[PDB]
Amino acid sequence: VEAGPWENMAYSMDSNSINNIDGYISYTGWYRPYGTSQDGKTWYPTTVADWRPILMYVWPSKDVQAKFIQYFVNHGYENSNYGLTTGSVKDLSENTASIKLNEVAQNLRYVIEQHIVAAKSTSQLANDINNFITTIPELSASSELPYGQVIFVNNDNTSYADSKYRLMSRTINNQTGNDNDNSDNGYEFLTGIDIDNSNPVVQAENLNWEYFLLNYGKLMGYNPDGNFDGFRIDAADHIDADVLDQTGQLMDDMYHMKGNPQNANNHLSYNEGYRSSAARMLNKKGNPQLYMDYVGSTLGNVLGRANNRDTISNLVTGSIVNRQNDVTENEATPNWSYVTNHDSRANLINGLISKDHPGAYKAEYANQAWQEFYADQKKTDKQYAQYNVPAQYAILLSNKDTVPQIYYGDLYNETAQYMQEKSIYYDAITTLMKARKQFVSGGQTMTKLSDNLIASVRYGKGVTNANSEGTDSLSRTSGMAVIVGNNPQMAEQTISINMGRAHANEQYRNLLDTTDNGLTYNADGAENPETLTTDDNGILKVTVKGYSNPYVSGYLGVWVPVVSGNQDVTTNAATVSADSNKIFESNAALDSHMIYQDFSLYQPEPTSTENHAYNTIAQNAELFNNLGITDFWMAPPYTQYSESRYNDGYSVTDRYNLGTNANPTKYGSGEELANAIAALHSAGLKVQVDIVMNQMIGLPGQEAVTVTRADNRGIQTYVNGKTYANQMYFAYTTGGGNGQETYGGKYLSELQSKYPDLFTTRAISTGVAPDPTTRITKWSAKYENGTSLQNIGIGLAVKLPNGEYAYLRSSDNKAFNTTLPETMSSADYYAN
């Protein structure tokens, strides 16, 4: 026939006329029909401008088709001349004859075309669709059942996304797939596209990625000494612990760390974690990385609270190391400790944001918490911020068997431009850091005096416990006493600290004491004079009382020997270990190191090239060495998701583009990074990169992927009594940038040549070696465990009445034959 409803057929049976992701078609998708009509008599051919929503021509079921009609007629498109009234359509439903809902929808379709001409656009239509969709449970976004994640699963419709692997929650001691520890060993999913670190190809891409970072400058042709020396492993509790093994193996191979504590300690690496099960996990592996200890919280609870504080003695037991008389080496779990870090600050400011604007909408100018925080930090009665900040760093920096980590935002006002403003705790913390390098070595003993007052003593270099004679030149004139109370109204009393028997009749300097206004570094207006002297057994009598001021809620006194000039107690590493199965060993040579975290989530965008963190770091390279920082923890340098909240580096889109001149990150360019590392190497520090293996966030590319609602362990769960499995999901899963395309897998050939064991050593969790035979030049579902929910929904993929998916063949998409809804494809259909 010359004209008719056959012109509902798509203009062309290809992507030029039909919206598809990977051949698959949506109920929110659009297409170009050959023709359209407003009455049924007169049919006009479309131009390339004339597309229409599929959901006028095709439905998941006859029910949705009935509610489509009823909805549209009640929301504007009634017309009695075409048999469409709220009354003529009232009793339609799933049991209505197919032929009748077809007929009525064809009529509804004419009125929609009348509406479109009356408005000269398809804009109101589009709106009315989106609005209708939200009234249908199976079409609206809430069908994906918030809040959590899906996992990607094998399915023949999406076979390009299949994996034999996706071994999930092989985390910490669960690596071996047999969770029998009766304890907390982490889970796979945090947020964003979760990366499958059990996949052997991805495991090899990780070794490629790490090799790039350890040679960044040289490979990029920037500063040929701008290369990272180790790793801060992000989300260590939330990835296949195979990579933790395989990273230690890389480093040992490249840098021969197993035999030499010297090599090992020049290539420091530390795992982020909040679960003590990691200690045991690393111990069993010979400690290829440091374990993040939890004394940070012991401190905050004992010293930081308003007033509801744990007894002082908690500082002795509240750690992976008991320090009540720690007078041995190589026994403790090699660890890194902290007073504060980026995430600990964020959780204070957030929350203080939930009282400014009530758990409502952060995506706005709720800053003011900072103005309000800074204002609180100066008070004596702090409503929010941590109390005894200096007392917390005093304990941290005098503790044996740890590598302490300093937080950028404690030395500086973090929301100001990078390093423009010193904090009110700068003088106090930098004084303690500098004292650490001059004085802290030997055994440790923490003795509780009265009720709320402890004394932490370090005996000196080569003074192994309170009874040692001392063995080093620096023994006599080293060691430190850190007196700490946590009760503002503690009474006046004289106490006695055993400084060690190596310290009989020795003069001691009042490095830091407590005044009414705050702190003094000159014994000025404190409880004690500038010098005090021990007796013949090493006991030092000291006066103490409680105080209440911006810096001290309780007491803080620090004593060290009188020295005739500058001295450095740091013990050098041996060129041979006393175990050689161990990578890292907790001894005086490890305790000579001190980590610095160089960033905050709330760090601002740089206002000028000079204000770039990489440039400001480079110019202050010698300040960090002066402070005693040996190891520099750089923020993740990767390209970020443009709509990320903090632009911090954890929401990565390109693992290999660390910034350009034209386009830097928050911290700057790559050339500028290479520069800053060269600067830090010249000042004598080693530097580690924050490596992010768990998630990628904001990948631009859509893919048709098969999914199953799951909890954070990656196991299917129910939300309010509902779940789904094996559902189609049009998810943002594909990307990596031009860096992943250029550098991804680029060095695997070189790696296999120099270090073959990397790809012959079978991973614990899979029993398979990492696989260098495939380069990852672009991330997709196949290398991913899944995603947090993307607010798109589960019932959009188009199934034809016979139950199969509608599919459109298209050059890249040849997994099936083209099979399309009759209404938009079948000349035969329309012929009757």
Q: Which residue positions form the known binding site for Ca(2+)?
A: 188, 194, 238, 694
The Cα–Cα gap between 628 and 536 comes to 33
Find where tokens 């188009």 sit: 798
Query: Least distance from C-beta 613 to Ca ion, angstroms?
Result: 28
Choice between 233 and 239, CB closer to Ca ion: 239
Span from 191-199, 713-721, 770-778, 808-816 in contact with Ca ion (CB under 5 A): 191-199
Distance of closest approach, residue 279 Cβ to Ca ion, in angstroms: 21
For residue 53 the two structure tokens come to: 């929503």
Task: Compare residues 188 and 205 and give the one whose CB is closer to Ca ion.
Answer: 188
Of residues 148 and 286, the one with the C-beta less far from Ca ion: 148
Q: How far is the CB of 179 from Ca ion (least distance, A)?
A: 16
Between CA 792 and CA 732 the distance in angstroms is 10
What residues contact 63, with CB distance under 8 A and at least 6 apart?
93, 94
CB of 786 to Ca ion, least distance (A): 9
> Which residue, 113 or 240, has its beta carbon nearer to Ca ion?
240
Minimum CB–partner distance for residue 764 and Ca ion (Å): 16
Q: Which single residue is written with the structure tokens 């933790």?
A: 244
Region from 16-24, 185-193, 672-680, 681-689 binding Ca ion, contact rule CB under 5 A: 185-193
Per DSSP, 270 falls in state: E
Cis preceding linkage at 147, omega within 30:
yes
Segment near Ca ion (CB under 5 A), from 180-188, 262-270, 438-446, 622-630? 180-188
Q: Fill in the per-residue mask, 239 to 258: x = in contact with Ca ion (CB under 5 A), - = not in contact.
A: x-------------------
Of the pair 126, 190, the CB lying nearest Ca ion is at 190
What are the beta bridge partners of residue 30?
A: 53
**Smallest distance, Ca ion to C-beta of residue 692, A:** 11
Spatial separation of the C-alpha atoms in residues 548 and 558, rounded to whole Å: 18
Q: State how far the Cα of 552 lies from the Cα of 484, in Å rounded to an integer.
A: 10
16-35 exposure pattern, b = at least 16 Cβ within 10 A, e = fewer = ebbbbbbbbbbbbbbbbbbb
* Of 416, 323, 344, 419, nearest in space to 627 by CA: 419
Q: Does 787 bind Ca ion (CB under 5 A)?
A: no
- Which residues in the chain are immediately followed by a break of C to N over 2.5 Å? none
CA angle 186/189/192 to nearest 5° reads 150
CB atoms within 10 A of CB 489: 12
Interacting residue with Ca ion among 188, 229, 527, 690 (CB under 5 A): 188
Choices 50-58, 302-310, 500-508, 687-695 (CB under 5 A): range interacting with Ca ion:
687-695
Binding residue numbers: 188, 194, 238, 694
Q: Which stretch binds Ca ion (CB under 5 A): 116-124, 182-190, 410-418, 582-590?
A: 182-190
Only one of the segments 34-42, 50-58, 398-406, 694-702 lies at the binding site for Ca ion (rule: CB under 5 A); that segment is 694-702
Candidates 190-198, 256-264, 428-436, 664-672; binding stretch for Ca ion (CB under 5 A) = 190-198
Closest approach, Cβ 783 to Ca ion, in A, equals 12
CA distances 120 to 22, 117, 131, Å, are: 32, 5, 20
Residues touching Ca ion, count (CB under 5 A): 5
Beta strand spans in 449-585 (E): 453-458, 480-485, 493-498, 507-514, 519-520, 531-533, 539-544, 547-548, 553-561
Closer by beta carbon to Ca ion, 388 or else 790: 790
On whether the CB atoms of residues 390 and 556 are closer than 8 A, the answer is yes
* Shortest reach from residue 302's CB to Ca ion, in Å: 33
Looking at residues 210 to 239 of the shown chain, list those that interact with Ca ion (rule: CB under 5 A). Answer: 238-239
- Does residue 694 interact with Ca ion by CB under 5 A? yes
DSSP string, 615-635: HHHHHTHHHHHHHT--EEEEP
Is 453 in a helix, a strand, or coil?
strand
| Identity of the residue, 158 or 694, whose beta carbon is nearer to Ca ion in the bound complex | 694
Q: Are strands 547-548 and 193-195 parallel, antiparallel or unpaired?
A: unpaired
Q: How far is the CB of 170 from Ca ion (least distance, A)?
A: 9
Q: Which stretch binds Ca ion (CB under 5 A): 183-191, 321-329, 359-367, 603-611?
A: 183-191
104: CB partners within 8 A, 6+ apart: 69, 83, 84, 89, 92
CB nearer Ca ion, residue 207 or residue 239 = 239
Nearer to Ca ion, 194 or 654 (CB): 194
Taking the complex as a whole, how short is the minimal distance between the CB of residue 141 and Ca ion, in angstroms?
Answer: 24
Smaller CB distance to Ca ion: residue 210 or 591?
A: 210
How near is the Cβ of 643 to Ca ion at its closest, in Å?
Answer: 22
Q: Tell me which of 113, 128, 194, 414 binds Ca ion, using CB under 5 A.
A: 194
Q: What is the CA radius of gyration of the chain?
A: 33
Q: 708 has which bridge partners? A: 151
690 part of the interface to Ca ion, by CB under 5 A? no
Q: How does DSSP assign 300-353, residue by residue? A: IIIIISSS-PPPTTHHHHSSSS--SSB--SS-SPPEEEES--HHHHHHHHHHHH
The 10 Å Cβ neighbour count of residue 181 is: 13
- Minimum distance of Ca ion from residue 271's CB (angstroms): 14
Rounded CA-CA distance 629/517 in Å is 29
> Residue 703 in 3-state DSSP?
strand
Q: Nearer Cβ to Ca ion, position 188 or 401? A: 188
Token look-up 């705790």 returns 425
From the list 52-60, 309-317, 483-491, 691-699, the region that binds Ca ion by CB under 5 A is 691-699
Closer by beta carbon to Ca ion, 133 or else 151: 151
User: Which positions lie near Ca ion, rule CB under 5 A?
Assistant: 188, 194, 238-239, 694
